């Protein structure tokens, strides 16, 4: 059911100058089959030494506004100034050895990097983020003492003080795999300011809890087993091809159970058949010719029940155009047992123009919140919807026209963009195209999420706080920019109501506390990669609910891009079921209990959905009601000049690893 009249006589032309530099790229856009294709010309200007000085997307060339980027290079070809129209201006200075010395980002924050002196090998020592002067990072290197060589610590960064605390490294294997590390966190009333020489006045800024984790690895450096920070041990086994074939978990004080008892693979190393300690068998089918995933068949071999069977169809180029489920509808939807077919169509640039699927009945309009679960008692159904998307010539999603018949909830939602930038907010915030760039930082990070919500950002462009009305939610990040803390402070009932999550290797320490006491303490043991059928274990140390049982195993079952759609217990019964709108909004949401729905945190593309609605994708935050990122691309023009675009506006076939 693919129509090739969309793609006739629409090639991609890269026009060259007399130096064979790509000075124009040419695209032809046909949205529907009968009409003519539209030539889009992206312009790249080069100076006389041959570096790309300015680049211009085809929408701002029609506006007669300036270029997207204005770069200034040195004589070697490295960028000294980059005046991006979405990410602001970046002034970068490197030394002789091409190490960064001075970085000024668009918010005016000067970053320093001081190194070792000329008698030492010149490794990194400290980083200073001057705004008024903070030594925000501090690296402690090791020597070649025979105590250091016993643990292979020679020439490593043993203590690494960063924006979230301390990351101490204890032992290395003979390959170079870290076998033991520990980490403390900065306290809530303190920021990273690691000034001075003595480290005894840096431990009074850190927490008392030192979270150490341990590993064991084979001679090939693959991780065999891993002890968490509490003592829960995961243990993996490998087959003769070096792939992974098994998994065992032993909680602290308990025996060793089985999480994955078999995992076979195809010839190309893709997953082929996997049986869990649940007992449920999933089986992946592939194309012979192209080795594309054409089937995910989740079968429970105790009732001969197929829980889901997703058969994918594709374009010739590899765009998902048809997903049908040959399973029956679950126990949450009474009186119906046929799952509708999801059909997708695309433009000539392979961006999603239309999408059908199923959604709940009492969902209403899509927003930042997720709807209430469909319990097995309230006998509710699902209905059919179809969404149609519209784009401008910069690739920004400008309009989602959700038209759902048989319920009369037909709504459109517009994204109001700038004329000079790709910065565009929802139409609830501003209807004027000229007051959109007042809602962003100078670096292009959005500063207001909703009409009553404001966002605060770090000096290095990371989300520091989502201010709601009465209750904020703030985060902390390490030197790589990965989130190590999430503290949700609800307003005053008689005191603050604080929920704290600590992100550790293979462990989430979700805890809830009032004024003086902890009212809930939850240790989520994770097994595997999120989006790769992850298994979670919810262990309650304090404040367990009445109806749930302790050490509850939640086996996640994922679709093509990793959206967690089915959760099963250790016996194989369904805990919670979810479907998604194509750009990530929760369309269908059924659960066994309301309190068993509160602990599903990883939802779409294997990414954790916060209480603010934003998905945390690594280096950036994503907002699914708009299909935009919350900030500009931190890496730059990796994927085109649109720094705010989603996955080439192709969110069914593609998915973004880690945001950047």
């Amino acid at each position: 059911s693919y129509n090739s009249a969309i793609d006739q006589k629409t090639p991609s032309i890269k026009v060259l100058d007399n130096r064979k530099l790509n000075v124009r790229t040419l695209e032809y856009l046909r949205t529907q089959a009968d009409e003519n294709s539209d030539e889009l010309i992206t312009f790249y200007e080069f100076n006389i030494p041959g570096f790309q000085v300015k680049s211009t997307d085809p929408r701002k060339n029609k506006n007669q506004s300036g270029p997207n980027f204005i770069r200034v290079f040195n004589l070697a070809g490295q960028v000294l100034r980059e005046e991006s129209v979405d990410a602001g201006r970046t002034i970068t200075l490197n030394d002789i050895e091409s190490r960064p010395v001075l970085i000024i980002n668009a918010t005016g924050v000067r970053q320093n990097h001081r190194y070792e002196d000329n008698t030492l090998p010149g490794r990194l020592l400290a980083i200073t983020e001057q705004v008024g002067e903070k030594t925000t990072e501090r690296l402690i290197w090791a020597g070649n003492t025979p105590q250091e060589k016993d643990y292979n610590l020679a020439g490593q960064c043993v203590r690494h003080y960063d924006t979230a605390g301390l990351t101490q490294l204890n032992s290395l294997s003979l390959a170079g795999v870290v076998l033991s590390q520990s980490q403390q966190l900065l306290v809530d009333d303190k920021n990273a300011d690691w000034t001075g020489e003595d480290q005894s006045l840096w431990q009074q800024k850190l927490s008392s809890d030192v979270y150490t984790t341990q590993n064991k690895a084979d001679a090939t450096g693959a991780l065999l087993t891993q002890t968490d920070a509490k003592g829960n041990i995961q243990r993996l086994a490998y087959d003769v091809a070096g792939q992974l074939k098994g998994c065992w978990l032993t909680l602290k004080g308990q025996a060793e159970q089985v999480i994955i008892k078999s995992l076979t693979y195809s010839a190309a190393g893709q997953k082929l058949r996997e049986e869990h300690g649940n007992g449920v068998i999933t089986e992946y089918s592939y194309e012979p010719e192209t080795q594309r995933l054409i089937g995910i068949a989740t079968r429970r071999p105790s009732d001969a029940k197929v829980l889901q069977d997703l058969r994918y169809q594709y374009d010739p180029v590899g765009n998902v155009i048809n997903i049908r489920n040959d399973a029956e509808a679950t126990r949450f939807w009474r009186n119906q047992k046929v799952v509708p077919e999801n059909s997708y169509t695309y433009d000539s640039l392979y961006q999603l123009i239309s999408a059908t699927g199923r959604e709940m009945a009492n969902i209403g309009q899509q927003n930042n919140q997720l709807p209430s679960p469909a319990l097995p008692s309230d006998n509710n159904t699902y209905t059919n919807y179809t969404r149609s998307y519209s784009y401008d010539h910069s690739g920004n999603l400008t309009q989602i026209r959700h038209s759902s018949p048989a319920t009369q909830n037909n709504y459109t939602v517009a994204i109001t963009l700038s004329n000079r930038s790709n910065r565009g907010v929802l139409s609830t915030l501003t209807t004027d195209p000229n007051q959109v760039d007042t809602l962003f930082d100078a670096g292009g990070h959005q500063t207001s999420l909703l009409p009553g919500q404001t966002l605060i950002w770090t000096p290095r462009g990371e989300l520091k706080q989502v201010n709601n009305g009465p209750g904020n939610e703030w985060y902390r990040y390490d030197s790589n920019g990965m989130r190590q803390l999430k503290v949700s402070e609800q307003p005053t009932q008689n005191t603050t109501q604080q929920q704290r999550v600590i992100y550790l290797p293979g462990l989430e320490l979700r805890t809830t506390q009032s004024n003086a006491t902890t009212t809930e303490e939850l240790h989520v043991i994770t097994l595997g990669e999120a989006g790769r059928a992850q298994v979670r274990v919810l262990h309650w140390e304090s404040g367990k609910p009445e109806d749930v049982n302790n050490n509850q195993l939640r086996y996640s079952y994922d679709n093509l891009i990793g959206s967690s759609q089915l959760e099963l217990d250790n016996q194989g019964q369904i805990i919670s079921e979810e479907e998604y709108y194509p750009f990530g909004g929760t369309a269908l949401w059924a659960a066994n209990s309301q309190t068993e729905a509160s602990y599903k945190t990883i939802r779409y593309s294997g990414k954790e959905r916060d209480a603010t609605g934003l998905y945390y994708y690594g280096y950036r935050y994503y907002q699914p009601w708009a299909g935009r990122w919350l900030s500009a691309d931190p890496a730059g023009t990796i994927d085109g000049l649109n720094l705010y675009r989603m996955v080439r506006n192709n969110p069914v076939s593609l998915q973004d690893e880690n945001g950047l």
Partner: peptide, 16 residues
């Protein structure tokens, strides 16, 4: 960066 479905990559249980 926008990559394809998760099935293409090798398994990874522990990294940074």
């Amino acid at each position: 960066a926008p990559e394809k479905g998760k099935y293409t990559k090798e398994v990874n249980f522990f990294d940074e």
